Amino acid sequence: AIRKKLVIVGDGACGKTCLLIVFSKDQFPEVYVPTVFENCVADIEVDGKQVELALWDTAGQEDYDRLRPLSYPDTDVILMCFSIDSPDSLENIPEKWTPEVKHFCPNVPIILVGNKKDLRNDEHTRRELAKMKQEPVKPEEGRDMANRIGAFGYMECSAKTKDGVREVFEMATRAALQ
């Protein structure tokens, strides 16, 4: 089987760890871990080809800025995440994550991922965002950002409902196979 390394990055609490676990274990996590720490290699088939996907979780907090580059060597595809309930995490795509990622992984394909799609129409989410004069990220905002950073594609998903999750990792696999 083809062996590809995947690294997921994005702001603290935007759903990275839950996405890896929903995809690799088909279950939304109960217990809390900052990063998936036990082995995390998932299988996927794309156009007849069997692909082995090593999932490298990272921490989004600035506390971990010193150590996160230790995960970047030999990366084949990057999942760059924001949360649809957080326009701030989108604005950190060009201001924080693309600079860091493209510095250590200069030509590694990027899939831009908007997590927590199930909160786009969530009442508490919109009330929280409205009090800051904000609304959830619209799909055209994610597309525009993806074009702007040169991502191979833009995908939306919800780890909670699993909607879009498999597609995210299929798209990432296609990018890495290039």
Ligand X SMILES: Nc1nc2c(ncn2[C@@H]2O[C@H](COP(=O)(O)OP(=O)(O)NP(=O)(O)O)[C@@H](O)[C@H]2O)c(=O)[nH]1
Does residue 18 bind ligand X (CB under 6 A)?
Answer: yes
Question: How crowded is residue 38: how many other Cβ atoms within 10 Å of its Cβ?
Answer: 5
User: Could you say which of 44, 90, 93, 159 contacts ligand X (CB under 6 A)?
Assistant: 159
Which of ligand X, Mg ion, none interacts with 149 (beta carbon under 5 to 8 A by kind)?
none
Give the dihedral sign, CA 168/119/9/113: positive
Annotated ligand binding at 125? The verdict is: no
- Residue whose C-alpha is closest to residue 113's, from 174, 51, 159, 155: 155
**Closer by beta carbon to ligand X, 44 or else 159:** 159
Backbone dihedral angles phi then psi of residue 109, each to the nearest 5 degrees: -55, 145
Q: How far is the CB of 80 from Mg ion (least distance, A)?
A: 15
Does residue 68 bind ligand X (CB under 6 A)?
Answer: no
Does residue 14 bind ligand X (CB under 6 A)?
Answer: yes
Q: How far is the CB of 119 from Mg ion (least distance, A)?
A: 17
Query: Which residues neighbour 46 within 8 Å (Cβ) at sequence distance 6 or greater?
Result: 170, 173, 174, 177
Annotated ligand binding at 16? The verdict is: yes
In the complex, the residues that contact ligand X under the rule CB under 6 A are 12-18, 34-35, 59-61, 115-116, 118-119, 158-160
